[PDB]
Amino acid sequence: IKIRITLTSTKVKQLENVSSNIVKNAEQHNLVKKGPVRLPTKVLKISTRKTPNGEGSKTWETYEMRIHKRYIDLEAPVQIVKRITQITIEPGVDVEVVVA
Amino acid sequence: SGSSKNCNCQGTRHPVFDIAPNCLHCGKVVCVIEGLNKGKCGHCHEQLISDKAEENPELLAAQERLDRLLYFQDTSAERTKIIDNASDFDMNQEVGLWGSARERALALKKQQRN
């Protein structure tokens, strides 16, 4: 069946929480389970002048947004993967599931 | 369609085949996917579709109440009502006669007649 779930939230502490109950849900159900894979962190950077006008010393500001993404692979019949998606939803943690 | 995917859902996750709801030999429920990809039973490999006095009488009677059972389920929204002895039961269809009081002015006219 090869169920794959990807999680791409910005805040990591809940993202580690969501990946914590999922991994133990499979083993407690005696499911062949593939460990979570933590992809390299994506650092989205924007650099801009601080001043609104054109006056002053050329001071530059850097802003960063971090994207933490993991995936976990599951292999099991549909009747248990369908009872995973509707739960483990917490604020600001994007979750999607792909079949096959 | 010739698909070999034997969908044995029995209508759990798919709509049932209207023409062939079940197996007439071993009772397996055949859904639309199961009916479309094969006309044979999944379990006992029996044909699903062949290529009132005469009809069995109580067989026709069985579906009469069965349709009522479906009718009861379809019309079960209002069967949950409680009669009570404190409900006004305004009996108005959707409004109090357009929110307008002149039908009882005749009763006032009747009272003027009295």
């Binding site: 791409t8 910005t10 994506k42 989205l44 947004m65 994207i67 993404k69 998606t85 509707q86 939803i89 917490e90 604020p91 600001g92 994007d94 979750v95 | -």
Partner: protein
Amino acid sequence: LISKKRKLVADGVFYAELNEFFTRELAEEGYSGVEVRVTPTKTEVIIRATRTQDVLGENGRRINELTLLVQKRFKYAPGTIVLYAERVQDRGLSAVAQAESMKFKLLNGLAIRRAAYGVVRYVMESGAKGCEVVVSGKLRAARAKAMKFADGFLIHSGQPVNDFIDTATRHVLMRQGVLGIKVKIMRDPAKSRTGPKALPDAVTIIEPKEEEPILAPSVKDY
């Protein structure tokens, strides 16, 4: 089909667009921030305000049209977006609500000195460790100047500023120009309950329990 690099950025702008819409509509309903939580097939938005009845209204009239307003602009299908209404806990400890209170007093002709002390006094009485309100503009004269009002103590540098200080800025429109209002409130670290419970430079030592010498070798057999 949008990449996750652009999806999260487009999600933050959705939060940014949705945030400024409420502060311009519920300005007299005490809007105090919004939160967006995404669930498959069901998107929910939590409005936080001081007056939960006005945000809801009779039969949820206001929240329905506000939910319906979001539907039209963002092209969300009916039944996908649902708005909530929730009161704000510890209204004295929210800078945004107290920023509105400062603006409210000025527009009614109240004195700048007395009104400013009123905002900081309520915040201090509500359990805040520190509070600071800054008023800038043409005060009693054409020549503009700033007047800072504060109580307790507020940190200014380091990471804990983000953790403990909430900042609110609200422009005020008056007949003589524009008066700026800035409110910073520092809550007690002892009630944070999310992350740090104290300043990084606070060290607390558990008092040891004294015990007199036994003065005699003895055994308690079992």
